[PDB]
Coordinates of C-alpha atoms and ligand atoms in Angstrom, one line a residue:
Chain A
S965 CA 95.7 81.0 101.8
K966 CA 93.9 80.1 98.7
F967 CA 93.3 76.4 99.4
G968 CA 93.3 75.8 95.7
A969 CA 90.7 78.6 94.9
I970 CA 91.2 81.0 92.4
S971 CA 91.6 83.7 95.1
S972 CA 91.5 84.1 98.7
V973 CA 89.2 87.2 98.8
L974 CA 85.3 86.2 98.7
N975 CA 84.3 89.6 97.3
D976 CA 86.6 88.9 94.2
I977 CA 85.1 85.5 93.4
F978 CA 81.5 86.9 93.8
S979 CA 82.2 89.9 91.9
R980 CA 83.6 88.3 88.6
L981 CA 82.5 84.6 88.9
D982 CA 78.8 83.6 88.4
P983 CA 76.9 81.9 91.2
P984 CA 77.2 78.5 89.7
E985 CA 80.9 78.7 89.5
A986 CA 81.6 81.0 92.4
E987 CA 79.7 78.3 94.7
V988 CA 82.2 75.9 94.3
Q989 CA 85.4 78.2 95.0
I990 CA 83.4 79.5 98.1
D991 CA 82.8 75.9 99.4
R992 CA 86.8 75.3 98.8
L993 CA 87.6 78.2 101.0
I994 CA 84.9 77.4 103.7
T995 CA 85.9 73.8 104.3
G996 CA 89.7 74.9 104.5
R997 CA 88.8 77.6 106.9
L998 CA 86.5 75.5 108.9
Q999 CA 89.5 72.9 109.3
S1000 CA 91.8 75.5 110.3
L1001 CA 89.3 76.7 113.2
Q1002 CA 88.6 73.0 114.3
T1003 CA 92.6 72.5 114.4
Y1004 CA 92.8 75.6 116.5
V1005 CA 90.1 74.4 119.0
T1006 CA 91.5 70.8 119.2
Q1007 CA 95.1 72.2 119.9
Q1008 CA 93.7 74.7 122.4
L1009 CA 91.7 71.7 124.3
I1010 CA 95.1 69.8 124.5
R1011 CA 97.0 72.7 125.7
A1012 CA 94.1 73.6 128.3
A1013 CA 94.5 69.9 129.5
Chain B
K532 CA 84.0 109.6 106.6
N533 CA 84.0 108.4 110.4
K534 CA 80.6 106.4 109.6
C535 CA 80.4 102.7 108.9
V536 CA 79.7 102.7 105.1
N537 CA 79.6 100.1 102.4
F538 CA 82.0 101.0 99.7
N539 CA 83.2 100.0 96.1
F540 CA 86.5 101.4 95.2
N541 CA 87.1 100.5 91.6
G542 CA 85.6 97.0 92.1
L543 CA 87.0 96.7 95.7
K544 CA 83.9 95.8 97.5
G545 CA 83.8 96.0 101.2
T546 CA 82.1 97.3 104.5
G547 CA 83.7 99.6 107.1
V548 CA 84.5 103.0 108.6
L549 CA 86.8 105.2 106.6
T550 CA 88.7 107.9 108.4
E551 CA 91.6 110.1 107.6
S552 CA 94.8 108.0 107.2
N553 CA 98.4 108.8 108.5
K554 CA 100.3 106.3 106.4
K555 CA 103.2 107.4 104.1
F556 CA 101.7 106.2 100.9
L557 CA 104.6 106.8 98.2
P558 CA 103.3 107.9 94.7
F559 CA 103.3 104.6 93.1
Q560 CA 101.2 102.9 96.1
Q561 CA 97.5 102.4 95.2
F562 CA 96.5 100.3 98.3
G563 CA 98.0 99.0 101.4
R564 CA 98.0 95.5 102.9
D565 CA 99.7 97.2 106.0
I566 CA 99.7 95.0 109.0
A567 CA 98.8 91.3 109.7
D568 CA 98.1 90.9 105.9
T569 CA 95.1 93.1 106.0
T570 CA 94.1 95.7 103.4
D571 CA 94.2 98.5 106.1
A572 CA 94.1 101.4 103.7
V573 CA 93.0 102.3 100.0
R574 CA 93.7 105.3 97.7
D575 CA 90.9 107.5 96.6
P576 CA 90.7 107.2 92.8
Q577 CA 89.4 111.0 92.5
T578 CA 91.0 112.9 95.4
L579 CA 94.0 110.7 95.6
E580 CA 93.8 110.6 99.3
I581 CA 94.6 107.5 101.6
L582 CA 91.5 106.3 103.7
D583 CA 92.2 103.8 106.5
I584 CA 89.5 101.0 106.1
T585 CA 88.4 99.7 109.5
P586 CA 85.6 97.1 110.2
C587 CA 82.8 98.7 112.0
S588 CA 82.2 97.8 115.6
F589 CA 81.2 94.2 116.4
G590 CA 80.9 92.1 119.5
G591 CA 79.5 89.0 121.2
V592 CA 76.4 89.6 123.2
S593 CA 75.9 87.9 126.4
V594 CA 72.7 87.4 128.4
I595 CA 72.6 87.4 132.3
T596 CA 69.4 85.9 133.9
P597 CA 68.9 84.9 137.5
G598 CA 66.7 82.0 136.1
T599 CA 63.1 81.7 134.8
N600 CA 62.1 80.1 137.9
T601 CA 63.2 83.3 139.7
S602 CA 62.2 86.1 137.3
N603 CA 62.0 87.3 133.9
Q604 CA 64.3 90.1 134.2
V605 CA 67.3 90.1 132.0
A606 CA 70.6 91.9 131.8
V607 CA 72.8 92.0 128.4
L608 CA 76.5 92.2 128.0
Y609 CA 77.9 93.5 124.9
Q610 CA 81.5 92.0 125.3
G611 CA 84.4 94.3 124.1
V612 CA 82.1 97.3 122.9
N613 CA 82.4 100.9 124.3
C614 CA 79.2 101.8 125.8
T615 CA 79.2 104.9 123.5
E616 CA 78.0 102.7 120.6
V617 CA 76.3 99.6 122.3
Chain C
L724 CA 104.1 77.0 137.5
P725 CA 101.5 78.2 134.8
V726 CA 97.9 78.2 136.4
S727 CA 95.8 79.6 133.5
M728 CA 95.8 80.6 129.8
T729 CA 94.3 83.5 127.6
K730 CA 90.4 82.9 127.0
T731 CA 90.0 83.3 123.4
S732 CA 86.6 83.8 121.8
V733 CA 86.1 83.5 118.0
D734 CA 83.0 84.7 115.7
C735 CA 83.1 81.7 113.3
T736 CA 80.9 83.6 110.7
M737 CA 83.1 86.6 110.6
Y738 CA 86.3 84.5 110.5
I739 CA 85.0 82.4 107.6
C740 CA 83.2 85.0 105.5
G741 CA 85.2 88.0 106.8
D742 CA 81.7 90.0 107.1
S743 CA 80.3 89.5 103.5
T744 CA 76.7 89.1 103.0
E745 CA 77.0 86.5 100.2
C746 CA 78.6 83.3 102.0
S747 CA 77.0 84.1 105.3
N748 CA 73.8 82.4 104.1
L749 CA 76.1 79.4 102.5
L750 CA 77.7 79.0 105.7
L751 CA 74.3 78.1 107.5
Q752 CA 74.3 74.7 105.3
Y753 CA 77.4 73.3 107.0
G754 CA 75.3 72.7 110.5
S755 CA 76.3 73.4 114.0
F756 CA 80.0 73.6 113.9
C757 CA 79.9 77.0 115.3
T758 CA 78.2 76.0 118.3
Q759 CA 80.5 73.1 119.0
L760 CA 83.5 75.5 118.7
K761 CA 81.9 78.3 120.9
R762 CA 81.0 75.6 123.6
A763 CA 84.5 74.3 123.4
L764 CA 86.0 77.5 123.9
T765 CA 83.6 78.7 126.8
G766 CA 84.3 75.5 128.4
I767 CA 88.1 76.2 128.3
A768 CA 87.7 79.5 129.6
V769 CA 85.5 78.6 132.4
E770 CA 88.2 76.0 133.1
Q771 CA 90.9 78.9 133.3
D772 CA 88.6 80.7 135.8
Chain D
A27 CA 136.5 92.3 85.6
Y28 CA 134.3 90.9 88.1
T29 CA 133.0 92.1 91.4
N30 CA 130.5 90.9 93.8
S31 CA 127.1 92.7 94.2
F32 CA 127.0 92.5 98.1
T33 CA 123.3 93.2 99.0
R34 CA 122.2 95.1 96.2
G35 CA 119.5 94.7 93.6
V36 CA 116.5 94.8 95.9
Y37 CA 113.3 96.4 94.7
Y38 CA 109.7 96.7 95.8
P39 CA 107.8 93.8 94.1
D40 CA 104.1 94.6 94.5
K41 CA 103.5 98.2 94.8
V42 CA 101.7 97.6 97.7
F43 CA 102.2 99.4 101.0
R44 CA 103.4 97.5 103.8
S45 CA 104.8 98.8 107.1
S46 CA 106.4 97.3 110.2
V47 CA 106.2 93.8 108.9
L48 CA 108.5 90.8 107.6
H49 CA 107.3 89.7 104.3
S50 CA 108.4 86.9 102.1
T51 CA 108.3 87.1 98.3
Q52 CA 109.3 84.6 95.5
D53 CA 110.3 86.8 92.6
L54 CA 113.1 87.5 90.1
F55 CA 115.9 88.9 92.4
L56 CA 119.8 89.3 92.1
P57 CA 121.2 86.9 94.3
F58 CA 123.2 88.1 97.2
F59 CA 127.1 88.3 96.6
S60 CA 126.6 87.5 93.1
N61 CA 129.4 88.0 90.5
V62 CA 128.5 91.1 88.3
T63 CA 130.5 92.0 85.2
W64 CA 132.3 95.3 85.5
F65 CA 133.1 97.5 82.6
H66 CA 134.9 100.7 82.3
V67 CA 133.4 103.1 79.7
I68 CA 136.8 104.3 78.3
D78 CA 132.6 100.0 72.1
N79 CA 131.5 98.5 75.2
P80 CA 130.1 95.0 74.5
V81 CA 126.5 93.9 73.9
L82 CA 125.5 91.7 76.6
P83 CA 122.7 88.9 77.0
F84 CA 119.4 89.3 78.5
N85 CA 118.6 85.9 80.1
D86 CA 116.0 86.4 82.6
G87 CA 116.0 90.0 83.5
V88 CA 119.0 92.4 84.1
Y89 CA 120.3 94.4 86.9
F90 CA 122.2 97.5 85.7
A91 CA 124.2 100.1 87.7
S92 CA 126.5 102.8 86.9
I93 CA 128.9 105.3 88.8
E94 CA 130.3 108.4 87.4
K95 CA 130.9 112.2 87.9
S96 CA 130.1 113.5 84.7
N97 CA 127.1 111.9 83.2
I98 CA 129.0 109.8 80.8
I99 CA 126.1 106.9 80.3
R100 CA 123.0 108.2 79.0
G101 CA 121.0 105.2 77.4
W102 CA 120.3 101.6 76.8
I103 CA 119.2 99.4 73.8
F104 CA 117.5 96.2 73.9
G105 CA 116.7 93.6 71.2
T106 CA 117.7 90.4 69.6
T107 CA 120.0 91.3 66.6
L108 CA 121.1 94.4 64.9
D109 CA 118.5 94.0 62.1
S110 CA 115.4 96.7 62.0
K111 CA 113.1 93.9 62.0
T112 CA 113.7 92.6 65.5
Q113 CA 111.6 95.4 67.1
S114 CA 114.5 96.8 69.1
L115 CA 114.2 99.0 72.1
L116 CA 115.7 102.6 72.6
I117 CA 115.9 104.7 75.8
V118 CA 118.0 107.8 75.9
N119 CA 118.3 110.9 78.1
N120 CA 118.4 114.4 76.8
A121 CA 119.1 117.9 78.2
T122 CA 115.4 118.0 79.5
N123 CA 113.7 114.6 79.1
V124 CA 114.1 111.1 78.4
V125 CA 112.9 109.3 75.4
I126 CA 111.7 105.8 74.9
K127 CA 111.0 104.1 71.5
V128 CA 110.4 100.6 70.3
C129 CA 111.6 102.0 67.0
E130 CA 112.9 98.7 65.4
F131 CA 115.6 100.6 63.7
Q132 CA 119.0 99.1 62.6
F133 CA 121.7 100.1 65.0
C134 CA 125.4 101.0 64.0
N135 CA 128.2 98.7 65.1
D136 CA 128.9 100.8 68.3
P137 CA 126.8 103.2 70.4
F138 CA 126.5 106.7 69.5
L139 CA 128.2 109.2 71.5
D140 CA 125.9 112.2 72.8
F152 CA 127.0 111.7 66.8
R153 CA 123.8 112.3 68.7
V154 CA 122.0 109.0 67.2
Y155 CA 123.2 105.8 65.7
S156 CA 119.9 104.4 64.3
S157 CA 118.4 104.2 60.8
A158 CA 114.9 105.0 59.7
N159 CA 112.1 102.6 60.8
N160 CA 108.4 102.0 60.9
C161 CA 107.6 102.0 64.5
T162 CA 104.6 101.6 67.2
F163 CA 105.6 103.0 70.6
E164 CA 106.9 106.3 71.6
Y165 CA 107.0 108.1 75.0
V166 CA 108.7 111.3 76.7
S167 CA 108.8 111.6 80.4
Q168 CA 110.9 113.4 83.0
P169 CA 114.5 112.9 83.0
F170 CA 116.0 109.9 85.0
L171 CA 118.7 112.4 86.5
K182 CA 130.1 110.8 92.6
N183 CA 126.8 109.3 91.3
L184 CA 125.4 105.9 91.8
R185 CA 122.5 105.1 89.6
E186 CA 121.0 101.7 89.9
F187 CA 118.4 100.1 87.5
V188 CA 116.5 96.8 87.1
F189 CA 114.6 95.5 84.0
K190 CA 112.2 92.9 83.9
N191 CA 110.2 91.5 80.7
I192 CA 108.7 88.1 81.4
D193 CA 104.7 89.0 81.3
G194 CA 104.0 91.2 78.3
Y195 CA 105.7 94.2 80.0
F196 CA 108.8 96.1 80.6
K197 CA 109.3 97.3 84.1
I198 CA 111.7 99.7 85.3
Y199 CA 113.0 100.4 88.9
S200 CA 115.5 102.9 89.8
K201 CA 117.4 104.7 92.7
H202 CA 119.7 107.6 92.8
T203 CA 122.2 108.2 95.6
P204 CA 125.5 109.8 96.1
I205 CA 128.5 107.7 96.6
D212 CA 133.4 99.4 93.5
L213 CA 129.7 98.9 94.3
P214 CA 129.3 100.2 98.0
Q215 CA 127.9 98.1 100.8
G216 CA 125.1 100.4 101.4
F217 CA 121.7 98.8 101.5
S218 CA 119.0 100.3 99.5
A219 CA 115.7 99.4 97.7
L220 CA 115.0 100.3 94.2
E221 CA 111.6 102.0 93.7
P222 CA 109.2 101.5 90.5
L223 CA 110.2 104.1 88.0
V224 CA 108.1 103.2 84.9
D225 CA 106.1 100.6 83.2
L226 CA 106.2 100.1 79.4
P227 CA 103.1 98.2 78.0
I228 CA 105.5 96.9 75.1
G229 CA 105.3 93.2 74.5
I230 CA 108.8 93.0 72.2
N231 CA 111.1 90.1 72.5
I232 CA 114.4 90.7 74.1
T233 CA 117.4 88.5 74.4
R234 CA 120.5 91.1 74.2
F235 CA 121.2 94.5 75.4
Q236 CA 123.6 97.3 75.1
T237 CA 124.3 100.8 76.9
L238 CA 124.8 104.0 75.3
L239 CA 127.7 106.4 75.6
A240 CA 128.4 110.2 75.5
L241 CA 131.4 112.3 74.1
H242 CA 131.9 115.9 73.5
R243 CA 133.0 116.9 69.8
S244 CA 132.8 113.2 68.7
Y245 CA 132.6 112.0 65.3
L246 CA 130.4 109.1 64.5
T247 CA 130.0 106.7 61.7
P248 CA 128.2 103.4 61.0
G249 CA 131.4 101.5 61.9
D250 CA 134.4 102.6 63.6
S251 CA 137.7 101.1 65.4
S252 CA 138.3 100.1 68.7
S253 CA 140.0 103.7 69.4
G254 CA 136.7 105.4 69.2
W255 CA 137.1 109.1 70.3
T256 CA 138.0 110.7 73.6
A257 CA 135.5 110.6 76.3
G258 CA 135.1 111.1 80.2
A259 CA 135.7 108.1 82.8
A260 CA 132.9 106.1 83.8
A261 CA 132.2 102.7 85.2
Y262 CA 128.9 100.4 84.9
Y263 CA 128.0 97.1 86.2
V264 CA 125.5 94.3 84.8
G265 CA 123.8 91.5 86.8
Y266 CA 121.2 88.7 86.1
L267 CA 118.3 88.1 88.0
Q268 CA 117.2 84.5 89.1
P269 CA 114.1 83.1 90.8
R270 CA 114.7 83.5 94.6
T271 CA 112.8 83.8 97.7
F272 CA 113.5 86.9 99.7
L273 CA 112.4 87.9 103.4
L274 CA 111.8 91.7 103.1
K275 CA 111.8 94.0 106.2
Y276 CA 109.3 97.0 106.0
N277 CA 109.9 99.8 108.5
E278 CA 107.1 102.1 110.1
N279 CA 107.5 104.6 107.0
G280 CA 106.5 101.9 104.5
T281 CA 110.3 101.5 103.2
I282 CA 112.2 98.3 102.7
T283 CA 115.2 98.7 105.0
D284 CA 116.8 95.1 104.7
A285 CA 116.5 91.8 103.2
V286 CA 117.4 88.1 103.4
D287 CA 118.4 85.7 100.7
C288 CA 117.0 82.4 101.9
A289 CA 119.1 80.4 99.6
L290 CA 122.3 82.2 100.1
Chain E
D291 CA 64.1 89.7 123.3
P292 CA 67.1 88.4 124.7
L293 CA 65.5 85.9 127.0
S294 CA 64.0 84.2 124.1
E295 CA 67.4 84.0 122.3
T296 CA 68.7 82.4 125.3
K297 CA 66.0 79.8 125.5
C298 CA 66.4 79.0 121.6
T299 CA 70.1 78.7 122.2
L300 CA 69.7 76.5 125.3
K301 CA 66.5 74.6 123.5
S302 CA 64.6 74.9 126.6
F303 CA 61.6 76.9 128.0
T304 CA 63.3 77.2 131.5
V305 CA 66.6 78.9 131.8
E306 CA 68.9 78.4 134.8
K307 CA 70.7 81.2 136.6
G308 CA 74.0 82.1 134.7
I309 CA 75.5 84.2 131.9
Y310 CA 74.9 82.9 128.2
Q311 CA 76.6 83.6 125.1
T312 CA 73.5 83.7 122.8
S313 CA 74.7 85.6 119.3
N314 CA 76.8 88.3 118.1
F315 CA 76.3 92.1 117.4
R316 CA 77.4 94.0 114.7
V317 CA 76.8 97.6 113.2
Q318 CA 75.1 97.5 109.8
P319 CA 76.4 100.2 107.3
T320 CA 74.6 103.5 107.1
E321 CA 75.1 104.0 103.4
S322 CA 76.5 103.0 100.2
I323 CA 79.1 104.8 98.1
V324 CA 80.8 104.0 94.8
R325 CA 84.1 105.5 93.9
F326 CA 85.3 105.4 90.4
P327 CA 87.2 107.2 87.7
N328 CA 85.9 110.3 86.4
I329 CA 86.5 109.4 82.7
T330 CA 83.7 109.5 80.1
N331 CA 84.9 108.5 76.7
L332 CA 83.7 104.9 75.9
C333 CA 86.3 102.3 74.5
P334 CA 86.7 101.7 70.9
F335 CA 85.7 98.1 70.9
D336 CA 82.5 99.0 68.8
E337 CA 84.8 100.4 66.0
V338 CA 87.4 97.5 66.1
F339 CA 84.5 94.9 65.7
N340 CA 82.8 96.7 62.9
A341 CA 86.4 97.8 61.3
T342 CA 86.2 97.8 57.5
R343 CA 89.0 94.9 57.5
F344 CA 90.4 92.4 59.6
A345 CA 94.0 91.1 59.8
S346 CA 94.7 87.4 58.8
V347 CA 95.9 84.7 61.4
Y348 CA 99.4 85.2 60.0
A349 CA 100.9 88.5 61.3
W350 CA 97.6 88.8 63.4
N351 CA 96.9 92.3 64.8
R352 CA 97.4 93.3 68.3
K353 CA 95.9 96.4 70.2
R354 CA 96.1 97.7 73.8
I355 CA 93.1 99.5 75.1
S356 CA 93.5 102.1 78.1
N357 CA 91.8 105.4 79.5
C358 CA 88.3 104.6 78.3
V359 CA 85.0 103.4 79.6
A360 CA 84.3 99.8 78.7
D361 CA 80.6 99.6 78.1
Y362 CA 80.4 96.0 76.8
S363 CA 76.7 96.2 76.1
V364 CA 77.9 97.6 72.7
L365 CA 79.1 94.1 71.6
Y366 CA 75.7 92.5 72.1
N367 CA 74.1 94.4 69.1
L368 CA 75.8 92.0 66.8
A369 CA 73.5 88.9 66.3
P370 CA 75.6 86.3 64.4
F371 CA 77.9 85.5 67.1
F372 CA 79.4 81.9 67.0
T373 CA 81.5 82.2 70.1
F374 CA 80.9 84.3 73.2
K375 CA 82.7 81.9 75.9
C376 CA 85.0 84.1 78.7
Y377 CA 87.5 82.7 81.0
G378 CA 87.8 84.0 84.6
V379 CA 85.0 86.7 84.3
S380 CA 81.3 86.0 83.7
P381 CA 80.2 88.3 80.7
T382 CA 77.2 89.5 82.7
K383 CA 79.5 91.0 85.6
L384 CA 81.8 92.8 83.2
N385 CA 80.0 96.1 83.6
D386 CA 80.8 96.1 87.4
Chain F
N821 CA 107.9 93.1 134.4
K822 CA 110.1 89.9 133.3
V823 CA 107.4 88.6 131.0
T824 CA 105.6 90.5 128.5
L825 CA 102.8 89.6 125.7
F852 CA 90.2 92.2 114.5
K853 CA 89.3 89.3 112.1
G854 CA 86.8 87.9 114.5
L855 CA 89.1 86.6 117.3
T856 CA 89.0 88.3 120.7
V857 CA 90.6 87.8 124.3
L858 CA 88.1 87.6 127.1
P859 CA 89.4 89.1 130.6
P860 CA 89.8 86.8 133.7
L861 CA 87.4 86.9 136.4
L862 CA 90.1 87.5 139.1
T863 CA 92.3 90.6 138.3
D864 CA 95.7 90.8 139.1
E865 CA 95.1 93.1 142.3
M866 CA 92.7 90.3 143.8
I867 CA 95.6 87.5 143.0
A868 CA 97.9 89.7 144.9
Ligands
LIG1 C1 89.9 113.0 87.8 O1 90.6 111.6 88.1 C2 91.9 111.9 87.8 C3 92.7 110.2 87.9 O2 92.6 109.9 89.1 C4 92.5 112.7 88.8 O3 93.9 112.8 89.0 C5 91.7 113.9 88.9 O4 92.0 114.9 90.1 C6 90.1 113.8 88.9 N1 89.6 115.0 89.0 C7 88.4 115.2 89.8 C8 87.8 116.6 89.4 O5 87.8 114.4 90.3
LIG2 C1 62.6 77.9 142.3 O1 61.9 79.2 143.1 C2 61.4 78.6 144.1 C3 60.4 80.0 144.8 O2 61.1 81.2 144.8 C4 62.4 78.5 145.2 O3 61.8 78.0 146.4 C5 63.2 77.4 144.6 O4 64.2 77.1 145.4 C6 63.7 77.7 143.2 N1 64.6 76.8 142.7 C7 65.6 76.9 141.8 C8 66.2 75.6 141.3 O5 65.9 78.2 141.5
LIG3 C1 84.5 105.1 125.3 O1 84.5 105.9 124.3 C2 84.5 107.4 125.0 C3 84.4 108.3 123.6 O2 85.5 108.2 122.9 C4 85.9 107.5 125.6 O3 85.9 109.0 126.2 C5 85.8 106.6 126.7 O4 87.1 106.7 127.5 C6 85.7 105.1 126.3 N1 85.8 104.2 127.1 C7 86.4 102.9 127.2 C8 86.3 102.0 128.3 O5 87.0 102.7 125.9
LIG4 C1 108.6 99.8 56.8 O1 107.4 99.9 55.8 C2 107.9 99.6 54.5 C3 106.6 99.6 53.5 O2 105.6 98.5 54.1 C4 108.6 98.5 54.2 O3 109.1 98.1 52.8 C5 109.8 98.3 55.1 O4 110.4 97.2 55.2 C6 109.3 98.6 56.7 N1 110.6 98.7 57.3 C7 110.7 98.1 58.9 C8 111.9 98.3 59.3 O5 109.8 97.4 59.1
LIG5 C1 109.8 108.1 109.5 O1 109.6 109.4 109.0 C2 109.6 110.4 110.3 C3 109.0 111.6 109.7 O2 110.0 112.1 108.6 C4 110.9 110.3 111.0 O3 110.9 111.0 112.0 C5 111.4 108.7 111.4 O4 112.6 108.8 111.9 C6 111.2 108.0 110.2 N1 111.4 106.5 110.6 C7 112.2 105.8 109.9 C8 112.3 104.2 110.6 O5 112.7 105.9 108.9

């Protein structure tokens, strides 16, 4: 999932986008992926209970 | 091949171990997001061969100690890693 | 009656950056999320045992 | 005449290898069980090109041998020509005024014009020949499939055949016929000339979401039309 | 050493008996390889820019470039540039 | 027999194996 970014591949963004413009896209991906992992952990905790 | 190598295939940056592929790539195929939405294989721009892209071994390292109060000796466990590579 | 579930472990760095040298440094700015997730999953695994 | 397309008209949408997986793709596809116009070769009408055309033919003597695309008979419309030959297929965006009826391979029915793109490739050659044409993004994509054999129920996927960088504007298209020892003129009556028996079908693509099943050998083996 | 890593993870100079997940292990690449096409002829962008004449806005000119090496550094030789903005790609990264 | 069943995700084995539970 792109999470609103230009692409879901980090290498692509770091290749054709400058650091000033690549940083925002990387942050957009990172927040979404961290949120997904946290949701997974919360569901795992509930199912473990 | 068979060595964990950093590669750049026509701008396709990545790191992994390249090995002979058994995929039945048709002539119009250039790369394969074969299984589980992963770029399993890529076509060689020069030899036109298909190479499987595998991410070279990783794993979590766990440390076993009897306690600093007892001894400083330590044992280390490499989770999910075959001993031939540590 | 189920008694236990699978013991899952996740490498947050690899999952978020997919083993890319660039954003691995950037992910450090987000703090101790990785430690939280690892501790929660380890607790779940020990609970299964 | 009208007939339904059954499950035909599916093609590889991405040119990316996938095996032993179910993949969902949203692209221009021919909806399942759609009514497709049915014609008999024994001139065949010019038909609209709304958002992509699915073309199929069935014959045993190679009567249909080309296609033409454009917006009007005027040479200034940047028309498209695809014609088969004894040894090769010729593709040209040659913006030439076309006769009132297709020629009968009488081997040509186009006038002189100044033109920009030309290409010769290996020929695209009881029969069941399937074609798909798309031009929405500055390209003209062709997918094809040949199998021995109304349209049969057998499921099959059309592989990508060629990709023309042409950026012409298309709204209507017509097919080309063949006839032995046939006279030709810029205009002719409906009687035409004697020719072999052949049939072909035309379908229109629509934006649809499909679930494609990829087998072990990277071949699409079945599909589902979500909105059907 | 592993004991120091465990101490840092626990944030204590004394470690109790047990098994601790401290860090992760990954094999680093042994070498770097670049694979690209074997073509050698440069693109005609330089000739296009320095053409004897240019088309008008009405009935403008279109050309498609293929099968050539696009060394964009040639374009930098022209001084009196008024616009060089690019969308989707940073100009410095075009070479790669 | 009746019940049946990277990108950074792995499964750790249980301490007690099926033989010991048996
Ligand atoms: C050069 O590249 C072309 C295009 O991929 C390929 O067909 C050919 O085999 C290559 N030749 C050599 C010597 O690498
Ligand atoms: C610490 O070590 C001493 C000496 O061996 C022992 O008597 C004591 O029980 C140990 N305590 C703990 C908590 O390990
Ligand atoms: C470890 O690798 C060696 C060499 O490939 C193999 O012979 C052995 O069976 C492997 N062991 C495990 C537990 O995977
Ligand atoms: C071909 O070019 C000539 C000379 O410019 C022009 O008179 C003629 O109309 C052109 N024909 C077409 C079909 O564009
Ligand atoms: C894949 O190809 C192999 C080799 O030709 C064949 O044995 C097998 O039946 C094929 N599988 C499918 C699903 O077509």
